[PDB]
Design a protein around this ligand. Sequence first.
Ligand SMILES: OC[C@H]1O[C@H](O[C@H]2O[C@H](CO)[C@@H](O)[C@H](O)[C@H]2O)[C@H](O)[C@@H](O)[C@@H]1O
Ligand SMILES: OC[C@H]1O[C@H](O[C@H]2O[C@H](CO)[C@@H](O)[C@H](O)[C@H]2O)[C@H](O)[C@@H](O)[C@@H]1O
Lengths: 142, 142
Amino acid sequence: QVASEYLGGPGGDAFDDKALAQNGDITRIEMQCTDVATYIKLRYGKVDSRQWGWANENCIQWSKKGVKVVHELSSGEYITSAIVTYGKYVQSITFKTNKRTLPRCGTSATEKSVTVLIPGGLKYISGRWGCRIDGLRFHAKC
Amino acid sequence: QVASEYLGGPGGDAFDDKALAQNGDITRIEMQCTDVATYIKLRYGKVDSRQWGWANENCIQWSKKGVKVVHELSSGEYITSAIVTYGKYVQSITFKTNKRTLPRCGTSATEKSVTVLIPGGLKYISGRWGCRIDGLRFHAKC
Ligand SMILES: OC[C@H]1O[C@H](O[C@H]2O[C@H](CO)[C@@H](O)[C@H](O)[C@H]2O)[C@H](O)[C@@H](O)[C@@H]1O
Ligand SMILES: OC[C@H]1O[C@H](O[C@H]2O[C@H](CO)[C@@H](O)[C@H](O)[C@H]2O)[C@H](O)[C@@H](O)[C@@H]1O
């Protein structure tokens, strides 16, 4: 059960998709994307997680909201790396799969950048959330 | 298994430790170090690789040489992060493990930098080499 280091800060509430991933492979990525990433929501098999971020509409006081971005993954498509910029919060996320690169969620990439290899493909994510994505951790199929 | 991008230039000869890595986890890191890193040589279990770099002593016409730096990894110690600065060649390499940060090899770190995180630990390296380290690629365990 390999896992990256936790990337981000201590705010928000803890979430962990571990149990949900027992449905199977990640089949879908949903995020909300502006100058930063404001939520992430993965689908394991047929089942979506909760919306991890943009806890409520009044969050518009502390950041932009953004556009709902979906990447449906095809059979046998696995997320094998992520470029993450982060500090107190997750700022931007760029996923790469064994089949294609995907656009960055979060047009600003000015904070500390890190390229995370995800051995075996991404199995699931954990992290912390509130108005946005306080932090992420990548759990690998390894 | 999952691997990073190739970091560096097109010169030298390709090398690949994949087959050697079947002999075990990385137990030792040897590099030659001046203002830049001029070779790298890992040990996989008890099996040493060839010296990847500093092909011969007249390489001194094209860069400084540097000193031999050896770091032995303890049992259960693995490389979780590599900061590489590079351009036409690899310039500097800073390894971090799950137990410590090792000193940078290559005192100059002015070239383009990338921090590669490897959850579960680096399994092996590949790349290109001649008088120095033309390029490096990092391979995870799955
Ligand atoms: O509701 C008041 C606060 O809203 C935000 O704080 C929430 O969301 C943050 C980012 O996800 C979390 O770090 C934090 O713990 C949550 O309370 C806003 O960022 C705060 O500045 C507001 O005080
Ligand atoms: O053999 C003379 C050459 O030495 C150097 O080139 C070798 O090492 C380089 C760096 O590792 C490689 O890029 C190159 O492929 C090798 O031939 C030097 O860089 C050359 O100028 C010399 O001709």
